[PDB]
Amino acid sequence: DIIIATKNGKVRGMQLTVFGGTVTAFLGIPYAQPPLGRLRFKKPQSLTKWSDIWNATKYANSCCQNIDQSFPGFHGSEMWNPNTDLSEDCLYLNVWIPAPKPKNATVLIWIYGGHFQTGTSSLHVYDGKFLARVERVIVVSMNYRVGALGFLALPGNPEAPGNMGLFDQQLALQWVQKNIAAFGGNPKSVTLFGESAGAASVSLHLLSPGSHSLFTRAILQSGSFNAPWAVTSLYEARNRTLNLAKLTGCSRENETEIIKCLRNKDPQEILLNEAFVVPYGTPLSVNFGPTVDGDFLTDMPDILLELGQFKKTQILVGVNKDEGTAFLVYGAPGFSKDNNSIITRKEFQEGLKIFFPGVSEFGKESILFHYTDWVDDQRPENYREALGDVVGDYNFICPALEFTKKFSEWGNNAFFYYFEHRSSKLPWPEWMGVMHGYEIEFVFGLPLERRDQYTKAEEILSRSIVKRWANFAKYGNPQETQNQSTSWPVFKSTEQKYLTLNTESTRIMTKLRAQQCRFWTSFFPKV
């Protein structure tokens, strides 16, 4: 019997066998009052408190969300879909602890992505037991509200203030500060890590003064709040809430009455209608996401980043080589995960229209001019490759590099990586290369499980990334010091060094996508 006394009452865990040892897991500990009825759209309230034992022995409900139904039966897409029941009653977190119980372990808190509209902490690729077993860190992960239920905003109105899902995350951090010591964790050694919308969340926790004392350091995998899809304007946010109201027959003149009507709607009606609030979205559109609320975020985050108003600490930031390809099969013409997707110039042009619906003819022309300087060949896959790079550079790579540059200008150590290894198991086809989302399994150490038929070179690579990430968490420095590795240099503006992660040549390079990012970061905002 593994019973731990938390601030709120006792919880029961279970033991797992992992690589010839044990990890103790507590799956599904509640951390907030379930946000139902009148609590829908509100900030999470603190937990009622209980005597007797809460059994934390299975993953909890995932938050309400629309499911990816694009490729039924296909593992490449369905692996991302939730794997417990959907419920509004979903504010639970998970804790993996090394055995024997550690004395004062560093804690890593994972925040999932899913574009702020989907995701859950229970996915197989987010299973923290390997990290716990291999590096003797404590791993924690939480479910937080997404879509309208988590991000619906009528700014200043505490019935629906915005950022509720970011506040769920923050309450989970607070839970760790208050309880992790009872589990053998060090509340003073907490690293946040997250991928995509989860990495954008981690970066907003660097900006939010309520989060400042709830963590030490931060790891941003393929995302940051300055990505163009990650923060919603207050004009866009109100238009969208108003639209959702109209769509559900919930339009009233009293802002407060609207929320009351929305609170009487069942979650399916809200979910069904979220897709249609943006008047024309793209495959990267965020219907309801982070807003400037005067609470979690006290000002536009670009202004805070530029003027140095953020927690001074070390960061670890990186991207994958083909960030953009995953999105091409969710609406660009001529693209398919079942053939080689060789597209013409014409299709390339129509694909720009899908990703850049608001942009002038001049603006799309200058994207094309910039990305079609073939040295060389011509060379059938030229346009297919160009569109993936457009989408990946504009949405993920140039913003992560810009985030890292601006952050490091205020004198902290930053480390940047470029992940270029394509999983031997990737279910998506070869043309999609090193996709968005597919470093996660290496970070969580899935290729260390030799029963799983990743390659030896993959086990070596993951073992090494697990060590770098644990070293950054524990010591603020992501070295692998023992195996004659490449030293990871700090990223500074000026040299802008970064490390590549792959199975052969890990190397130090500079100025990733220099020409492309000058285009997106400085020229494109003007068109």
Ligand X SMILES: *[C@H]1O[C@H](CO[C@H]2O[C@@H](C)[C@@H](O)[C@@H](O)[C@@H]2O)[C@@H](O[C@@H]2O[C@H](CO)[C@@H](O)[C@H](O)[C@H]2NC(C)=O)[C@H](O)[C@H]1NC(C)=O
Ligand Y SMILES: *[C@@H]1O[C@H](CO[C@H]2O[C@@H](C)[C@@H](O)[C@@H](O)[C@@H]2O)[C@@H](O[C@@H]2O[C@H](CO)[C@@H](O)[C@H](O)[C@H]2NC(C)=O)[C@H](O)[C@H]1NC(C)=O
Ligand Z SMILES: *[C@@H]1O[C@H](CO[C@H]2O[C@@H](C)[C@@H](O)[C@@H](O)[C@@H]2O)[C@@H](O)[C@H](O)[C@H]1NC(C)=O
Asked if 290 and 151 count as a contact pair (C-beta separation under 8 A), the reply is yes
Give just the sign of the alpha carbon dihedral 228, 234, 63, 24.
positive
- Residue 274 vs 458, nearer CB to ligand X: 274
70 belongs to the binding site for ligand Y (CB under 6 A)? no
Residue 213: which of Cl ion, ligand Y, ligand X, none does it interact with, CB under 5 to 8 A by kind? none
- Residue 77 vs 314, nearer CB to ligand Y: 77
Task: Tell me how far, at minimum, the Cβ of 80 lies from ligand Y, in Å.
Answer: 21
333 belongs to the binding site for ligand Y (CB under 6 A)? yes
Task: Choose one: 132-140, 231-239, 337-345, 483-491; the region binding ligand Y (CB under 6 A).
Answer: 337-345
Closest residue to ligand X, based on beta-carbon distance: 279
Task: Report d(CA 180, CA 188) in Å as an integer.
Answer: 10
Residue 333: which of ligand Y, Cl ion, ligand Z, none does it interact with, CB under 5 to 8 A by kind? ligand Y
Task: Report d(CA 320, CA 223) in Å as an integer.
Answer: 11
**Those residues with Cβ within 8 angstroms of residue 255's Cβ, 6 or more apart along the chain or in another chain:** 154, 157
Task: Tell me how far, at minimum, the Cβ of 378 lies from ligand X, in Å.
Answer: 39
Please report the beta strands in 446-501, taking only residues with DSSP state E, as ranges in sequence order: 497-501
Residue 265: which of Cl ion, ligand Y, ligand NAG, none does it interact with, CB under 5 to 8 A by kind? none
Residue 436 annotated as catalytic? yes
2 belongs to the binding site for ligand Y (CB under 6 A)? no
Asked if 9 and 50 count as a contact pair (C-beta separation under 8 A), the reply is yes
Residue 336: which of Cl ion, ligand Z, ligand Y, none does it interact with, CB under 5 to 8 A by kind? ligand Y
338 belongs to the binding site for ligand Y (CB under 6 A)? yes
Give residues in contact with ligand X (CB under 6 A): 235, 239, 243, 246-247, 276, 279
Residue 177: which of ligand Z, ligand NAG, ligand Y, none does it interact with, CB under 5 to 8 A by kind? none
Q: Round to the nearest angstrom and report the end-to-end CA distance of the chain.
A: 64
Residues in the chain: 527
The angle formed by the CA atoms of residues 355, 360 and 364, to the nearest 5 degrees, is 55
Taking the C-alpha atoms of 446, 392, 225 and 476 in order, what is their torsion angle to the nearest 10 degrees? 50
Asked if 415 and 491 count as a contact pair (C-beta separation under 8 A), the reply is yes
Task: Report d(CA 401, CA 416) in Å as an integer.
Answer: 8
474 belongs to the binding site for ligand NAG (CB under 6 A)? no
CA distances to 337, 401, 484 from 379, in Å: 20, 30, 40
Residue 338: which of ligand X, Cl ion, ligand Y, none does it interact with, CB under 5 to 8 A by kind? ligand Y
- Residue 353 vs 463, nearer CB to ligand NAG: 463
Q: Which is the catalytic residue, given 195, 436, 458, 480?
A: 436
- Residue 169 vs 462, nearer CB to ligand NAG: 462
Task: Report d(CA 494, CA 496) in Å as an integer.
Answer: 6
Residues between 122 and 161 with contacts to ligand NAG, criterion CB under 6 A = none
Closest residue to ligand Z, based on beta-carbon distance: 189
Residue 16's identity, in one-letter code, is L
Q: Which is the catalytic residue, given 88, 274, 323, 458?
A: 323
Task: Tell me how far, at minimum, the Cβ of 159 lies from ligand NAG, in Å.
Answer: 9
Give residues in contact with ligand Z (CB under 6 A): 103-104, 186, 188-189, 216
Task: Report d(CA 438, CA 408) in Å as an integer.
Answer: 27
Question: Which DSSP state fits 485?
Answer: P
Closest by CA to 3, choosing from 62, 59, 54, is 54
484 belongs to the binding site for ligand NAG (CB under 6 A)? no
Closest by CA to 439, choosing from 390, 396, 486, 391, is 396
CA distances to 83, 321, 327, 362, 444 from 330, in Å: 22, 19, 5, 25, 27
Residues facing residue 107 across a β-bridge: 138, 190
- Residue 211 vs 216, nearer CB to ligand Z: 216
Residue 306 annotated as catalytic? no
Residue 254: which of ligand NAG, ligand Y, ligand Z, none does it interact with, CB under 5 to 8 A by kind? ligand NAG
- Residue 442 vs 472, nearer CB to ligand Z: 472
147 belongs to the binding site for ligand Y (CB under 6 A)? no
430 belongs to the binding site for ligand Y (CB under 6 A)? no
Q: Which of 267, 318, 334, 437 binds ligand Y (CB under 6 A)?
A: 334
Q: Which of 467, 478, 488, 499 binds ligand NAG (CB under 6 A)?
A: 467
- Residue 1 vs 361, nearer CB to ligand NAG: 1
How many C-alpha atoms does 364 have within 13 Å on its Cβ side?
Answer: 17
Count Cβ atoms below 10 Å from residue 96 Cβ, excluding itself: 26
Closest by CA to 152, choosing from 261, 67, 253, is 261
Residue 480: which of Cl ion, ligand NAG, ligand X, none does it interact with, CB under 5 to 8 A by kind? ligand NAG
Summarize as ranges the residues that interact with ligand Y (CB under 6 A).
333-334, 336, 338-340, 342
Catalogue the active-site residues: 196, 323, 436
